Write a protein that binds this ligand. Structure first.
Ligand code: FAD
Ligand code: FAD
Lengths: 488, 392, 259
């Protein structure tokens, strides 16, 4: 009677589509269709595909234990085609899904509403990803916000709270789907299966593991988040991002659970933990703002993503891109993160800032290139969140980070790795190199680098581009961009 | 409810051998298209976890390093040799929620093929292992060891006596040394005991066409002596089935027969000296023959074609190539596979790569009282031979 | 034997400086044996047996230096007086920096420089490799161990080298080189030891992790490895090294029976 279409909500708690299909009375057919060709350039990358293959298997058993035959797995190049074969094949009255906010889904999914409503299907879409809908939060003239601070300040002062997380169905009734077939989905090249499976050393995809990681963070490093959130040398953050990208966890549960921890800590005098919750919710609000930006000010053609860097003369150099991917740049904080991104599919947010800032400030390679690599290597590769991050580090946002400027690697090192233990964990070659030079080995005297057993150029690479050359080329590239910009 | 969750590993010799070529005989090359599938079953899987089974394989394959190599071909002025690179033998771990006792007393079509790995010198000739070992746990706490062993590497006495030097290793006894140091050097008409088949390129398995199948039967000592009361045991229960197959197909007056005679054995542990030779029912119909005379036929009417099969230049197939071929192995230490104290409850050997003529292997049982015989048949044919044998 | 975990006592540098009484270790372990035996914990009971044997090896270390000291007629490693050592300072430096292309060798060589300590079995892996693959003067890698081991012990270093070179009847077989997959399977079943010290190889599946040069190019690239640029190529090949081993050992046995 009702189809529940899964997309990026691979959970069973607080899933309004599935919870309303079950409470309608009739049967519920839960299904997922793999239509990546519809995603154009944003076709899910290598390691994100490896997550879905485990997340779906994991969500299958969850569904089956609640009284389902299966999760129907359909394959297509058009989602409507596969979806309305299923409404026919499995003969339903309704199609329920929770609506997304990326520019691809926003118009593909309104082509589905009409396509399906022309063959008599009733369609309803629900909120599964945001505390507040993007249209629900505006300024005093009713307009979208343009910076993050006024926007998040509004959500924190909204006249109602984010809806409480719904319970899962008591059980779901699917009927006999012994008839209905499921297409064996292919997510992994045979050639890559053996290295993709090593991602499980660090991660376990699934609604169940997302829930255990949240109560692990809530009862652990959340109390110190106020003071440690920027450090990459301890597990200072929640490690929930891939779980949240695929919707395996409610953000409305996280909001509600964290607000309860705050009330208790406030009654215990734990003032530093109370601010920890304030700051961690802000990080949850940055995910809200990523959707708010892609909905209210989408990529257009009149003005694209990185539109302020149109006439920026990028260095085109595949050699440099190869050194960056391999973490052989010779900048230890960058190399350390590029090694961990390849090995685990994840990076602390500030190491993301470092590796991406280095990409467009020192090597000054097309940001597209690095945006694509991120898409193939991140387990939490998220359309709106990746766009917001690259927009932030390149200075397309007014909120964003300054354009005409390069970070001193010691500034990065002292903030995200003060004792150098992040570099030493991922680059053991430099273990015996003192903290004083571990983030800029090129500046150390030969005696100090010989004591550390480091030969810059054989044991560990030389700086592929020197800072002073990078800054000189950055001013020459921006002046080139600014004389060009006025010429229009 | 088949056997499941295969996950495969490799083991190598403990020492690296180096630049080293293992020249194989032309008696070795004569069997390059046949493959033995031995499976041993054990009451207990207790104390024989996969690392205890794997750990002794490393010293074992230093004594038997050519089985951990792979095949190459030298150029002519193209005879193949064993590259002494330690590719190692692949080990396949699998389980079955079956009780092993249930399955051995099932007369099951194709369990030999479920508990040994399915692969031969094949498309990837130069990276194909010579040996695979599959460890199958059951929910009975049982454990079957199925060995997929290329006949090019060695005969069945050689295969069976090297696997138990492995079990001698595992249990802490010292095997008596390997012998391969007298090197093998090279040397008419198509011998009649074998069969010519076309230039074989890089996959050394002849496709049979009509789908062959394994099956086997216990012949007890009671039928062992009505045998008597009617030439030793193996060529009367060889004769039993020879005619039984002959009322199945009819043209069964020629048959060649494989001999594992220890009297012709060189002493070298990686050889190929099983002795080959024709049998013909000229007097009258094997299907029309009384068993006690085709038994008498297979003892003294034997014909020595073994020297000539190795001297054959060209690819041949002997078990099931030209005639039906009975199998002389009843005297091969198969219940010597002592896992420290445990020797098997059940041992059966299969084969593949044997032509559509079929073949019958005659080999011992637990008590040394009767025999076990595996029959390779055009699968449609075991339907009737089981009836055909049921009378006997 | 495992190095992928903290499986041994790590009392090595403490015992060298007499910071901990071996006699106290003995008495406490022996009494731990008694309680476990009485608790039906046979494996644990068996464990103290082997651990005391490891303590005894340190006893034997002083036994051999008191009874059979070595100066001039049989100095340490006198039996290979007549060995044709590869005098190649380039190869030595590549061994020092863990750039040899053999993971288990490179992993351990990093940890040695990093933490001044190595597991016993890794102490032989990088040492067996130093004299049987690169075949450099054993006196050279001895002086490196002396400079980079916190538990640098005169007698026990002597015993350990004598063991891997085969200089005494208890030792290891001379004309023979360990296959890296043998080492890996005994000391690192899941390759997690070198993944931890060589994060470059983190995506290399366990089957090839100890011998990447034998992997198909399709697997190397799937792990993002490119031998020669991402992780080094094997500086010396095994075949070319056991070959060199025969040519160096019989040349010396030829020199042996000639004096
Ligand atoms: C260049 C660049 C690229 C990025 N790409 C991604 C991406 O593909 N996917 C992704 O989820 N995040 C991305 N981010 C944001 C940020 O790096 C990650 O959200 C964070 O590192 C995930 O770790 P965590 O779960 O421990 O975060 P926590 O600190 O534990 O935060 C909790 C949750 O809040 C959300 N969140 C936190 N920071 C941000 C942020 N800046 N923007 C949006 N949501 C946020 C995430 O859902 C995260 O799981 C990117 C940032 C930059 C600068
Ligand atoms: C080439 C080589 C060099 C070595 N150099 C040293 C050295 O400089 N100093 C040193 O103390 N050991 C040395 N050893 C011995 C051994 O490698 C270390 O003692 C051991 O790995 C240290 O780890 P552990 O303390 O956790 O050992 P455990 O397993 O905890 O053993 C307990 C103690 O017994 C002693 N011991 C154990 N094995 C040996 C052994 N084979 N020989 C001597 N004593 C042993 C050590 O004092 C050790 O702390 C060397 C071995 C080799 C092969």
């Amino acid at each position: 009677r009702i189809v529940v279409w899964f997309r990026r909500d691979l959970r069973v708690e607080d899933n309004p589509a599935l919870a309303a299909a079950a409470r309608a009375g009739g049967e519920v057919v839960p299904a997922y269709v793999w239509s990546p060709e519809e995603e154009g350039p944003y076709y899910p990358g290598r390691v994100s595909r490896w997550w879905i293959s485990q997340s779906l298997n994991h969500l299958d058993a969850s569904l089956r234990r609640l009284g389902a035959g299966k999760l129907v797995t359909r394959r297509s190049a058009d989602a409507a085609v596969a979806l309305l074969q299923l409404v026919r094949d499995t003969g339903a009255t309704h199609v329920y899904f929770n609506h997304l906010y990326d520019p691809i889904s926003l118009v593909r999914d309104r082509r589905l509403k009409e396509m399906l409503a022309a063959e008599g299907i009733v369609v309803q879409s629900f909120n599964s990803d945001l505390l507040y809908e993007p249209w629900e939060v505006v300024d005093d003239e009713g307009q979208p916000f343009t910076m993050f601070d006024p926007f998040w300040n509004r959500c924190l002062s909204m006249p109602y709270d984010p809806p409480a997380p719904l319970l899962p169905p008591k059980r779901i009734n699917s009927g006999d789907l012994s008839m209905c077939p499921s297409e064996d989905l292919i997510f992994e090249d045979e050639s890559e299966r053996g290295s993709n499976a090593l991602l499980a050393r660090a991660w376990t995809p699934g609604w169940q593991n997302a829930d255990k990681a949240l109560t692990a963070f809530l009862n652990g490093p959340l109390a110190d988040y106020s003071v440690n959130r920027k450090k990459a040398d301890s597990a200072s953050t929640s490690l929930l991002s891939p779980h949240l990208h695929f919707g395996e966890l409610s953000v409305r549960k996280v909001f509600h659970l964290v607000r309860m921890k705050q009330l208790v800590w406030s009654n215990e005098g734990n003032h530093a933990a109370e601010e920890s919750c304030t700051l961690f919710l802000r990080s949850i609000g940055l995910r809200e703002y990523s959707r708010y930006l892609s909905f209210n000010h989408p990529s257009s053609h009149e003005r694209p993503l990185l539109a302020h860097l149109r006439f920026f003369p990028w260095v085109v150099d595949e050699s440099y891109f190869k050194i960056w991917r391999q973490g052989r740049t010779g900048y230890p904080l960058v190399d350390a993160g590029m090694r961990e991104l390849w090995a685990t599919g994840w990076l602390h947010d500030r190491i993301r800032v470092v590796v991406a800032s280095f990409f467009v400030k020192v090597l000054q390679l097309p940001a597209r290139w690095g945006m694509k690599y991120f898409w193939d290597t991140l387990l939490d590769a998220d359309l709106e969140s990746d766009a917001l991050g690259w927009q932030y580090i390149t200075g397309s946002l007014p909120d964003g980070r300054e354009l005409d400027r390069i970070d001193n690697p010691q500034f990065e090192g002292y903030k995200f790795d003060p004792h150098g233990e992040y570099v030493r964990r991922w680059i053991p070659e430099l273990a015996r190199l003192p903290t004083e030079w571990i983030h800029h080995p090129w500046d150390a005297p030969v005696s100090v680098l010989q004591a550390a057993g480091i030969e810059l150029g054989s044991n560990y690479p030389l700086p592929i581009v020197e800072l002073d050359a990078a800054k000189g080329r950055l001013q020459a590239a921006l002046s080139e961009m600014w004389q060009l910009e006025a010429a229009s | 409810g088949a056997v499941h969750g295969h996950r495969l590993s490799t083991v190598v010799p403990s020492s690296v051998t180096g630049e080293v070529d293992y020249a194989l005989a032309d008696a070795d090359l004569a069997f390059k298209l046949h493959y033995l599938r031995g499976v041993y079953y054990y009451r207990s899987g207790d104390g024989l976890a996969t690392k205890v089974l794997k750990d002794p394989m490393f010293p074992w394959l230093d004594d038997h390093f050519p089985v951990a190599g792979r095949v190459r071909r030298a150029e002519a002025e193209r005879r193949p040799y064993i590259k002494c690179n330690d590719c190692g033998v692949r080990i396949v771990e699998a389980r079955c929620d079956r009780d092993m006792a249930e399955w051995i007393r099932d007369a099951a079509p194709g369990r030999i093929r479920q508990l040994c790995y399915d692969k031969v010198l094949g498309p990837e000739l130069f990276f194909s292992p010579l040996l695979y070992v599959q460890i199958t746990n059951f929910k009975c706490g049982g454990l079957a060891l199925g060995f997929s062993w290329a006949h090019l590497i060695g005969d069945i006495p050689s295969a069976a006596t090297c696997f138990n030097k492995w079990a001698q290793i595992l249990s802490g006894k010292k095997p008596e040394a390997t012998v391969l140091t007298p090197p093998n050097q090279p040397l008419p008409a198509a011998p009649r005991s074998v069969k010519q088949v076309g230039p074989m390129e890089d996959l050394w398995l002849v496709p049979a066409g009509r789908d062959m199948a394994c099956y086997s039967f216990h012949v007890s000592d009671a039928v062992l002596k009505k045998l008597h009361q009617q030439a030793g045991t193996f060529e009367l229960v060889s004769a039993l089935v020879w005619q039984a197959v002959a009322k199945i197909r009819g043209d069964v007056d020629t048959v060649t027969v494989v001999r594992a005679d220890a009297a012709a054995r060189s002493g070298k542990s990686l050889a190929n000296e099983m002795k080959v030779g024709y049998v013909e029912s000229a007097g009258s119909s094997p299907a029309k023959t009384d068993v006690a005379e085709l038994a008498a036929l297979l003892a003294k009417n034997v014909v020595d074609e073994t020297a000539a099969v190795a001297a054959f230049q060209g690819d041949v197939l002997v078990y099931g190539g030209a005639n039906l071929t009975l199998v002389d192995m009843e005297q091969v230490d198969l219940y010597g596979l002592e896992i420290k104290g445990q020797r098997p409850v059940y041992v059966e050997y299969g084969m593949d790569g044997v032509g559509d003529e079929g073949a019958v292997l005659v080999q011992p049982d637990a008590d040394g009282r009767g025999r076990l015989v595996t029959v390779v048949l055009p699968g449609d044919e075991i339907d009737s031979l089981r009836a055909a044998l049921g009378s006997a």
